[PDB]
Amino acid sequence: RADQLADESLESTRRMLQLVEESKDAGIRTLVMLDEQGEQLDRVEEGMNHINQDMKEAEKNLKDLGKARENEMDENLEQVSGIIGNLRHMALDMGNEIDTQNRQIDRIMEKADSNKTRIDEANQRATKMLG
Amino acid sequence: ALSEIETRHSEIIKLENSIRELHDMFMDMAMLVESQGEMIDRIEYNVEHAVDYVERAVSDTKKAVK
Amino acid sequence: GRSMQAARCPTDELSLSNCAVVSEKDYQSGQHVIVRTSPNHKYIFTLRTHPSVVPGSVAFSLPQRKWAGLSIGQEIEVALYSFDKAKQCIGTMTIEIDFLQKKNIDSNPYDTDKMAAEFIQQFNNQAFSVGQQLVFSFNDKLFGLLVKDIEAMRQKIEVGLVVGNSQVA
Amino acid sequence: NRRLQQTQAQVDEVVDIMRVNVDKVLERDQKLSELDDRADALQAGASQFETSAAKLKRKYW
């Protein structure tokens, strides 16, 4: 048991790597997207802004027209440590991308709604002058 | 010295333990973020396109007054 | 014989009797038959009717199915077999007993005299073959018997018929 | 030796980092989930405006 633990747990330290390494792989796909999506939402936000503009004009037109075993076991830890730093790297990129976009969602939701109203009002004045 | 060798193991496992679970989270993570990634691929679609629907409307309205 | 269809044992009560449960519209309790699975696999069991068995099918217990290598829903041929009370009369049959389920294994003592007494009081006038596997209900405890040798009333026979004056070891 | 009994918290601390990382992302899911029902539903009304604006074009233009 004594050795079945100083080695088995040692295998866990070795595994402790792929465990925190597979996490990076899982983090990459996330970050890679969070970044890709970040730029996407930029062109997406343009939509809420593009519509925000046109609607103003559209409304006006509708208004104008409407009217050594332990030595290694100690090293593996250092390995985990070096990787722990990485976990911080992603934790920040993921964090700064989350907070920057959440607030972006706010602006999107705002303008989107603001324009929704203009569409409804215009749709109630246009539907009548149909055909 | 035995005492230190046994106490060592005790702390090592308690360590090994906390580890395995943290790994469990990323697994579920990659399954969540991805499940959300597809929920945005349609957004970008419905957005830049809605810009076309609105653009076509604002254009027709202008050429309906001049 | 008539093509029959293997089935599962109705209740657990008949699952501890080591008897092929059949219907009352085909055979009758007390008769013996010889199941045929292939040109080189002949087995002999004891019948025991039950108002649950469907006409044209014979139900076997878990142990039996493992011994005779039977499957639930396979075609088998059953033919009436008549024992010869002149050479198949068991008088001394050695049995290899052991805990059926390794789930409940104890080191408690089990009086053999009481076993051989309840053994014949439940497995009388039945067919037993060498190497056969079954279950023995002794004091709400399940076991796994395995016939090793059978002696008539000394010629060692392959298959015999336990009677009232049958000794068991 | 001591590194073992020590490094133990070097991860228990991260186990907390992800605990928030898993939550942060999930919080965005709901923010984008609702935005998915108000943004898509938004253009839905735009479709009504595209049809209305198209007809006002075949009558006054």
Place this chain on the structure above:
Amino acid sequence: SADYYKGEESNSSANKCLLKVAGYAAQLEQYQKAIDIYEQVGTSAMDSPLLKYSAKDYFFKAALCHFCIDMLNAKLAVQKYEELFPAFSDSRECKLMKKLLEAHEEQNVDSYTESVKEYDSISRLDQWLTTMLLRIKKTIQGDEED
């Protein structure tokens, strides 16, 4: 619902629902129909080497679900499972199963009840697992005075 998701290319959501279906299906006696659902959701998960990752648990659940079969449906399901000992994820799926199959295919009820006590360490047993594990612990006993 999962059908609709499965037609919108949205694989994730589709599986999300399927898991619910089979999950509550085994908790209603529909053990076999459950393993089948786990097989489908298991095949439609390997196509994506990003799901290889969750594709374990499915085999564990499916191997646990038993429609009272007398053959080795589970010993076979655990076999179909591709694993490598040094691996980790995998050690959290079949490894236990094998030990459970031996405790069942061997009719022993201490080793199963103790192995479920050990696995509960490296991997916490959720509600589902518990309920079913007890059902198997009883198929053992039920098999016992049987």
Place this chain on the structure above:
Amino acid sequence: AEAMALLAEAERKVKNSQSFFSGLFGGSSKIEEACEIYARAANMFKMAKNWSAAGNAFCQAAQLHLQLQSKHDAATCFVDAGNAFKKADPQEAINCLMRAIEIYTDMGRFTIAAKHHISIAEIYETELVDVEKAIAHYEQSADYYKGEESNSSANKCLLKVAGYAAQLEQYQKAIDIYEQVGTSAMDSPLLKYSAKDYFFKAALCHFCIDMLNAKLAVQKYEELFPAFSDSRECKLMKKLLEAHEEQNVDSYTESVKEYDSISRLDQWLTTMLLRIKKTIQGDEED
């Protein structure tokens, strides 16, 4: 509410009005009415799980939409039809997508064009099993992504290209791609750690070169000893480079067996490693 009825009415209205029925003004509205019809049909065909019918229906509403002069919302339909045929039983899945890209591409929409371009190369591989055509698409698509300053997506595609390129036979053309995707990855400290596997793959890929392209590629890599991420990359490679430069198919196959402990090998690696195993055996009884 019957699809079969709608499909008929649509037809009756989708046709360049003739005689008096035409007059002066065309049927730019009629063609649209038909589009709405077929759309409604494809719709109920999708609830009925008749997929095939749903897809072909969308194809109809789409083609007609083109006949109306509205490439945008048309292409959108082409996509809907693709999603139908894909999760269906007939074909057309590949056709609808190509018919969608020709539109997103000539309309000024490359972002979404590439979005469907990769989907295409993904189907032409996981279905049609046409690797050579899929690579061509994964590539042309990565060009667009990389143009939309979506380096992230670009590499996502390049990895596919090289990845399957090493599987076909193109080991060299694979490493070149790994070199490019490797140089354009360091500019982002968010891929440093991942930039390892790239060097591992590129060093593993061999186009039957006699020099030390690998011994050189491994040297180009920057590693020390207190690095643990790097432990799963070149450290192994060197051992493999020595087992190859010594025609010892027993040290290579043993080292792969050891490394397969600390870092589980995947299908890709397995296949290639065995290829290198055979080049060695093939150098021994040689």
